[model samples]
Structure formats: C-alpha cells, structure tokens
Target: PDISAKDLRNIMYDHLPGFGTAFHQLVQVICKLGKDSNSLDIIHAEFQASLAEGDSPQCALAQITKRVPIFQDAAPPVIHIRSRGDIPRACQKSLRPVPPSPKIDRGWVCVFQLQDGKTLGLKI
Candidate 1:
C-alpha cells in the first residue's frame, strides 16, 4: 500500500490537530535538511519543546534556524510583497499557480513575509 502526497498531507491535517500547518512546513524543511543526521522525530521534538516554552511559531522556527546552519547568519526576519512579475528570476520557477490568469496583468502578487518582520505590502 502506498500513500500519495495529498493523502499524506490530509492524514497530517486530520491527526495532528493544531499542528497541521507546522507539521507540513517541518516536513518540507526536513527534506531540505537532507544529509543531516537528525531524524524528523528529533527535529519535531525540538520544535515541540520550543513551543512548550511559549515561543510563537516564528520565534520557534528562528530558534531552529539558529541551530540549523542552513538558515543562520541571516538578518532578522523581514517581509515584503512583490508583483508576481517582480519576483526574482530565480524564484519564479517555484511560484505556485493561483488560477484565473487572463492577460499580462494577472492581478496576482506574492505576499512575502518573515516572522520577525520589517516591512509588508499588498498590491491590487
């Protein structure tokens, strides 16, 4: 028996209660954290501990980012919004599709924000 990505996401959503979004985000981070010896369970345990200590999700993730080299050395969390067309050429490839595109002005923009926050915006 095999499970699809949608099925796996649904399962997490159903069984994890309040942690559904966090669970999925953690999974994605763990995947990118490949080659590291830490198992998903260990990382999740640490996240839980952080939350237990009364940290907001962003703060908790910042703590994880501190320990995890991949996200370290970055400035405090900052957020910004940009037109979909303004997204860096590099990131465009990974943009998710949001329906109803009709012309050059698709009226869709990317809302980018970080936990610590420095700036924010919304267009159209």
Candidate 2:
C-alpha cells in the first residue's frame, strides 16, 4: 500500500506481432553487443566471410550467435489499443496529444516496465 507494485515479466519474441529479417537480426545483435566500430567491423567482416563461403542464411546466424554471447535481460512493455484510461495509474503517468492532434476521441500511449520502474514512453 506504500510503494506501488511494479509489474514485470519476459517478453518473448514470439509474443511480438511479427518478425525480423536475418540480416537485420544480425545488425541488431551486433548493435546490442555495444562493441566499437573496430569490433563491429570485425564481426561484419566475419559475416561477410560466412556469406561468401556459401553458408546458409541461418548458418550465418549460427556463426555469429556461436561466437557472440547473447545476453537476454528483460523488460515488458504495454501498448494500449484504446485509451490512457485503459492504463492503471501505477503505470499511467503518461499521455500524448489526443491522437490525430484532436480529430479523434482517443489517445495512444506506450509504457514500459523496466528494472528502474515504469517508464512513460514520451514520443517526440
């Protein structure tokens, strides 16, 4: 009753609406690795090598995944299809310009449950 409970959970990729291409997936993995250009260039070159060597598309993924340590942490996000009222106050300190900037009666917001706390997705 004192501090608001912060809900959290794993958001499996399967839970997402769709998917990403292998090349794009490789780009994401490399970016998330937080390595410098030198390291990125090295990995990029490694993938190019895989592609040149006739590695299957997924085989290329395996080559990268095998060499890279995939660290999966966590954060669950909320996407409301209706109104901000649909969001509980605990995670609802968020609002946006009424969609269409006033043509509609609804508002859209994206909130995230993170390690720190509820993060209001403030769009620019």
Candidate 3:
C-alpha cells in the first residue's frame, strides 16, 4: 500500500529521535546545495571521500552519521529515479523537457515500516 506524506512524517516523528529537525535541515541544505555548482562539487568530493571510508553513499557529510544512528551500523544508500513524461504534469513541470535527463527539483527522505513486516525490493 502506498503511504501518504503526512503518515510518513508522523511515523518518523514517533519512532526517530530528532527526525523532525534533521529532516527540516536536510530540506534547507538541498535547496541551497542543488542551486550552486561549487557547493555541489564540494558535496560530490565529500561523497567520494566518505565512500572511500566505507560510509553512506547518501551524502558525504559525516554529521549525517551523528544524527541518523542507523548510519553507524551501515552506510546510507543512494536512490535515484529518472523523471519522464510518465510523471504527472504537476510533478514534471519544473523538470527539464520530457526527453532530456531530468533535473531533480524535489525529493523525499523517508523511513517507513510495514504492518506485516513484508520485505520490499529497491530498483537498482
């Protein structure tokens, strides 16, 4: 079953300590980070360094580990999706032309649980 954004946020607030604040900060960071090439380069360089250290691929910031305890156990994984015309117009309007490589304008960073504990596979 698909979960709503509010449901996801509520779940995070209840189970994860400081998730609310961390998520807020992440949103701010992404807004700034994506708009600037130099910042993106710095982030990319940091990501490479973190990967060399067997850290999460999500981002190179070591501070992420400080807040998201799960990173202590395993490197955070990276997920990417290509936006195509299949996406609703509202979702794709800010993206590049439908046939071009989609420019990411928004994203979701979430953690969720299943009522039945069913496992799910991520697209590679």
Candidate 4:
C-alpha cells in the first residue's frame, strides 16, 4: 500500500492532541520541511546548535524561547533529562536502513522544566 505525504501528515496531526496553533504549525513545517526520513535529525541538530551557542541553560532556553513564544514570558530554568528511550514503534515503522548495523540508534526522551513551575516530557 502507498500513502501520500498529505495523508501521512493528517494522520500525525490527528494523533497529536492539545497542540496549539503555533505548535501545530511548527510540526507541519517540519513534516513538510525535508525528506521525512531526516526530519527528526534536523530538529535535533537545531537543538544542539542552540546549546553550543550558549553557556548556561538559561542562555540556551533564551535562544530557543523566542522561536517558540509559549515560553517567552516565563522565567528561564535549567533543563535536564531523566531518561533516554527508543523511538515509538509506530514512528519507526517507516524507517529504512541507512547504514546496516547490529543495533540501531532509535531516538531519545527528555524531561524539561520551566522556572515558573511548569514541566514537560519531550520525545525526540
């Protein structure tokens, strides 16, 4: 069976709940940004770039906070991840072999907190 990109995106969006308009647009942008296979890596690279450009966690937060205005007015806080996990089976269903290997680097999970007492778990 073959599915068009539009159909795939609609499915993804439908599964993502409580996502705001801005967040939805951001996801959509990434969904259509490049070849689907590399979208996750592209986003991770952008995050790493921001971290490299900053010294402190607050600084890193500031660098990205502007791009996602939801955190703009909040006090910046240190961010840390408690656990790293494999990519969801659902998402990995479309993965193709890049470099054939005994083991694969699936993905990662992280926890982040804001100075204002808000917290979030992100899967990357």
Candidate 5:
C-alpha cells in the first residue's frame, strides 16, 4: 500500500462530501501538517501528557483511538514484501548468513506475523 499523492487525492475525492473547494483547502492544510514534525512524535507527546495526568497506558491509547481513523479499525496493519532486496543491509548483516529454517529460503529475507496480526517483512 505505497500510496502516492495522486492516489491520496483520489481517495479524498471519493470519501469527502460535495465541497470541492473546501476539500482542496483541506488537502493544502494536510500538506502543511506533513511539513511539521513526525506524526509518531506528536502521538508520543500526547500519550506522555495523558500519562502525566495519571491515565493508564490503556486509557491514553483509548484517547488516541478516538482521534485517529486508522486506530479505529480492529484489523491490524499489514506489510507485504514486493521483493527480496527490500531487507535492510544492517539487518542482513546481523542475522545468520544462512537461514537455519526452511521458512526463509534466502538468508536475507525475514517475515514475521505478530500475534496481534501485524505483518513485518524484510528482504531485497
């Protein structure tokens, strides 16, 4: 799911209601937001503030769930390996030069499916 800007624009057009001009403005605002600091840092700060206010980690995550759309989905994030070379060089260096199991035919590629349904794939 490597989405390009044009793909995003099309998605917005399909989802947003009849305000074309307003939607265009919103897109500009979103672009400006992207120029700001990383989204993960922003979420981390929010969770930290919640923790300072005596909220449990679960409570803090629940608060964040209310604000973020993707968080609302029960299905976990998925990752796909398009090729073998997608694996990072550092990771390949750290792992066994030859895979010990049949699951990994190539020494460089590694795929893990977490208990929570998140998929991680590393390879070229």
Candidate 6:
C-alpha cells in the first residue's frame, strides 16, 4: 500500500492521543533521531507512507524506542531562560521545526552536535 505523506502531529493527536511526560518523551525521540536518522524530511516521507499501511507499520515506534536509550525520569526538564545573561556560553543552542505540511507545524525540538561527536538534546 502506497500513499502521500501524513502529517505526524495529526497522527500523534488523532492516533496515539494525550500529553505531559509521555508527549515529551515522544518529542525527545523526534529531536534525537531527526538529527541522526537521515534528516527530518526524508524520515517524514517514509513515515507518511506508512501512516496507516494496514498491518500498521506504525510498529516503527516500538522499533525506535528499542533503538534509543531513554533518559532517567527523575531528571529535570529544561529550564526556561529569561535573558541573555540568564543562560550560559557552554550551552548555546537553537530549536528547529521538523517537517513541512503542506505540514501543520507541530512545534519544535533540537539536537546539537559537539566536536567530540556527542549529541545534545534541547526541547522547545
């Protein structure tokens, strides 16, 4: 079964449903993988095609979770910074929107790379 792309935010809301830490976990998965997994757009194309490909290739979510080592839950969320000096130089960063909808911007997330090849995640 083949078809045009699906708006994942819709799939998330319309399909899986709900929010809070579970939603943030979903977002973390998005940001980390988008930076490493062959660029966000291409991933969307593949995801869209499987939007509801019958037997539900959506199992890819399970596969993805299996692949990533989720973080410790007790960890604090990102602190919302108020001003320039309120932040630190050691952590300069940016959040990027993923996918174009004819793409309902389902908000944004970020991943930064270090010279040492470590990936850092920032939620927006």
Q: Pick the candidate with the highest lDDT.
A: 1
43-79 per-residue lDDT for model 6 (tens digits): 4444455554632333434333333333212121333
Residues 61-120, model 5: lDDT tens digits? 445444433333322212244433343344433333322331211212334344554445
Error at 81, model 6, angstroms: 13
The true-versus-predicted C-alpha distance at residue 6 of model 4, in Å, is 0.7
Q: Is candidate 3 or candidate 5 better by lDDT?
A: 5
Q: What are the runs in model 2 whose C-alpha is more than 4 Å off? A: 1-23, 34-38, 68-124
Provide the overall lDDT of each model, using Cα atoms, as 2-decimal numbers: 0.39, 0.35, 0.33, 0.36, 0.39, 0.37
Clash tally for model 4: 0
lDDT tens per residue, model 4, 1-124? 3444465456446645444332333344343432344344334344457657754432332343344333334332223434222323343333233222211112112224435544443322
- Superposed on all Cα atoms, the candidates' RMSDs to the truth, in angstroms, are 13.4, 17.6, 15.9, 16.9, 16.3, 13.0
What is the Cα-based TM-score of model 3? 0.25
The candidate with the higher TM-score, 4 or 6, is 6
Preferred candidate (lDDT higher): 1 or 2: 1
How far is 116's C-alpha from truth in model 4 (Å)?
Answer: 35
Tell me each candidate's TM-score.
0.34, 0.34, 0.25, 0.25, 0.29, 0.32
For model 4, the run of ten residues with the poorest summed lDDT? 100-109
Using lDDT as the measure, name the better of candidate 2 and candidate 4: 4
Q: Write the per-residue lDDT of candidate 3 for residues 15-123, one digit (tens) a residue.
A: 3233324343233333243233233333333445666787644343434333333333331122233333322333222322122222122222222222444211111
Q: What residue pairs clash in candidate 1, if any at all? A: none
lDDT (0-100) at residue 62 of candidate 4?
A: 32
Ranking by lDDT: 1, 5, 6, 4, 2, 3
Candidate 6 weakest lDDT stretch, 10 residues: 98-107
**Candidate 6 deviant stretches above 4 angstroms:** 1-14, 21-24, 36-38, 55-58, 64-124
lDDT of 2 by residue, 11-104 (tens): 1122222243323323343444425322444445555677689875445544654554331221112433344343444333344333322211
